[model samples]
Target: KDIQLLNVSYDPTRELYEQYNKAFSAHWKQETGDNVVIDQSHGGSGKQATSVINGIEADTVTLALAYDVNAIAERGRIDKNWIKRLPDDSAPYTSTIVFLVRKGNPKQIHDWNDLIKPGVSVITPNPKSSGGARWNYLAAWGYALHHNNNDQAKAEDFVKALFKNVEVLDSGARGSTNTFVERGIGDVLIAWENEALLATNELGKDKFEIVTPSESILAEPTVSVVDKVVEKKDTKAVAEAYLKYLYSPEGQEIAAKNFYRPRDADVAKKYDDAFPKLKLFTIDEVFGGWAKAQKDHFADGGTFDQISK
Candidate 1:
């Protein structure tokens, strides 16, 4: 038998899935004697989720956040309990936000405060459209709150100050990375940890450096089988297996290789040094949860719109 799966994922995961897809295809063939073909679609997380809801026919969704998955679940494309179906809340791997600065540390962007300094240029995606952008926003907001003793006004001001330094508001994380690394547009890129790692280690170690912030959010990019799509495509079982396999050792290994922090304790230990320890906060702890965070910060007329204006 032959089966094909379409994984709609957010930007910056192009390389991660490229490697995982092959490993899983080989594993599926060995286990079930069936040829499996895994396809991928990538873009801003929010836009990717919208595409899935607007009918992209994705068999699986490995998006940048659970909130996007929840949006699809709201449309009934996925089960409402999708998060509970897999380990670690359907998040096989986790990541955080960090700063990718130029070689020689021109702007001295060592923490969130450095981003808002006079004359310092920052680059990040738009929170309304990008999941990674929302994480980056919250990471800064959380840092502000912690430093200001939980003052909401001060946090908003802090975020606003940082955004004031942003020179380009790319629609997605990858675009922002390109704006910083390819086009040389900004002094620093507020980037996903994985993207920063890729740029620093593989893209141009000689040209870039990663500055881990003092505090950041624990970003859990969710994965799930698109219930309706898989049912209609008759790929339910294989689709489920595809997401399930992401929890396997091989899957964790691939994730770690791509710089994602795997959830598996043993796997995390093996690649411990690859990740830097930081004061990490969760959406639930800092923002009440994604729904609240999204509505309060990224929704129409939300805080982002108010401040970015």
Candidate 2:
């Protein structure tokens, strides 16, 4: 019987997934006589998680945020100990929030504040739908709170200003990126650094300028083997090996080359020039970790409620 690995991932991993599938297939074919096939499913992180919760049979899930994975655990699709199974902050790679500006940055949008500039249209995904957008929303709110000395009112005002300029709330990261880079709908596009960089590098460097905010959240993409599936499929050993391989130097290098910030210091340093140096904050600092952050911000009746008003 052929071995199959099912993966449910977030939007920005499209390029990475293609490369990973090729590498994994080649390695599997060379090592074992049995063929290995990876069936990947990609979409907004929340939607992907929902699918998995509703029985998607994903052998592993590589989502945009930890909270999405936690939701899967809560639904009993996976165990909560999943994070402890991985290394380097529970992710083999890290990423930061960034902006995809129009050519020459016509609006002069340099930082998070400029996103709210008068008449400057901002394009961003709906945080309620996209995990990437949730990070973007927090990054903007965090920047405001930090600048205003943790003033809640100021943070709220900043978010209002930012959203006031939003012309369209795309469904996911890819949709928002398309809206900004392809359709030319917004003046500033808040996106993942890797996604923004990939767009600029692949879609004509002269077309867009990638800008890192003065301060941004460091996002980590995590992976783990599903113990239940492994037991049922009797492939625990191979499943564990796959997760281990993701943190190996070779895997880290693959992740970095694909635009994610590899957790391996050596691999990450090689791509230092590609990303700008900026003050990075983790979700733990302000929102009290993924659990609290989800409840207070991204969950139903959270901050998104007020923002929609």
Candidate 3:
């Protein structure tokens, strides 16, 4: 039998999933003697989740933040215990935030603090709409808290100052990247490390440079099968296998090749040359994981709103 699975993922993963789709389909075809085709949908992680919840016919979701996928499950589009369904905490590959600046090191943007300086315009999507933006905010928030001796108030104000320099709030990560690279706006772009690599190394190598901050947050982009939709379509088996492939050695290698941080130690080491060493902290270690972090920082009237005001 032939199967077609729809993978709804966030922006910046188009390059990754485009490659992964071919790999998975080939693997599935050879391993099962059955043909499989994987389709894709990419946008802001939050918006992707919203679409899945409202019905985009997705078989699975690979979202930037766990909370976004959690939103789909909370809406009953997936199993309530979706995270427990897959290995690696439902997150296969991870990444960190970094700065994408103009070539020749014009602004000399070296770290998170540099974006806070007057005249340095930061370009990232809106936190209210994009998961990548939340991670960017937290990367700076975490950096501020650590640099300020963990003072809560000072950290809040530090983040506020950082956002004050944001010039345009795009609707998605890809849009923000376009805003920086194509639209010719802003001095720095807070983006996924993988995205930064793509832009500087391939997309517009002649025009951009990467500035890996001294520290950045470990971003866990989670995934899971959408049970509600899959059950009706009877694509659960392929859906589950699709995401599980993301954890396999072949899958991990594919992820590493695409610039995501691989969980497989040997694979991670194999690609270490491209991914530089840095102090990376997880959400749990810094803000008590996504749930509380969402409530306190990203929820309506949350810290993000506070900063905006």
Candidate 4:
């Protein structure tokens, strides 16, 4: 039997899932003697979640944040206890925020502070839709809080200043990456570490440099099987297997090879040199987790709205 599964994911994972889908298909064929063709959908994490909730028929979702998965769950497309279904709260791998600067480091943009400097054009996605954009926003917020004795007002002002320098607010991370790399619109890009690494090491090799900041956020990109969709399509078992396979050694290795920080200790050690050490804060410790963080900062008329305008 031929089984088809749709994986709705956030932007910046196209390359990763392309390779991962092939691997999962081969592995599933070996184990079940059935061909499993995995389809992928990528966009702003929030947008992807909205689409799934609006009936995209996603067998599974591998999105940029647990909050997005939680959104789908809220609409009854997935299980409320979905986070408990897999390891690490169903987040198979993690990533962080970084800066992707053009080669030669002309702006000398080394940290969050440099981004707000006058005349320094910046490129980043809109936080209202892009999960990676929210991570980038929080990383800067965390950095400001650390430097300003945890003053909320000061942190808000700092983020507002940074946004002032942003020349283009693309709707998704990949689009923002293109605005920086392909369109050459900004001096620097606030990017996911994996995206920055890909640009520096392969995508725009020799054309861009990855500048690790003093601090960033610990971004856990979660995954889950869309229960309602799977049930309706009668693909629950294979759908479950599809997400579970993400934790396997082969999957972790594929994640590491694609520049996502692997969860497996051995796999982490294997690709240890690729990741840089930095002060990474958690959404839980800093903003009281995604539920609160979303309401306080990203919801309509929230802090992002206050600052973005």
Per-prediction TM-score, please? Answer: 0.98, 0.95, 0.97, 0.98
- In order of listing, the candidates' clash counts read 0, 0, 0, 0
Q: Give the top-scoring candidate (lDDT).
A: 4
Question: How would the candidate models be sorted by TM-score, starting from the highest?
Answer: 4, 1, 3, 2
Q: Tens digits of per-residue lDDT for model 2 on 11-48?
A: 87888888877776777677776677787888888888
- Which residue runs does candidate 4 get wrong by more than 4 Å? none
Report the lDDT of model 4 for residue 155.
99
lDDT of each: 0.92, 0.83, 0.90, 0.93
- Give the better candidate number (1 or 3) by lDDT: 1
| 1 against 2, candidate with superior TM-score | 1
For model 2, the stretches where C-alpha displacement exceeds 4 angstroms are none
Off by over 4 Å in 1: none
Model 4 vs. true fold: TM = 0.98
Tens digits of per-residue lDDT, candidate 1, 42-123, equal 9999999999999899999999999999999999888898899998888888999999989989877788899889999899
When summed lDDT is taken over every stretch of 10 residues in candidate 3, the lowest stretch is 79-88
**Candidate 3, 1-309: lDDT as tens digits:** 988888999999999898999999999888899899888999989888998888699988999989998888888888788888877789888899988999887878888888889988889999888999999999998999999999999999999999899999998999999999989999999999998988978889789988889999999899988888888989988898899989899999999998899999989889988886789999999999999999999999999999899
**lDDT, residue 269, model 4:** 95
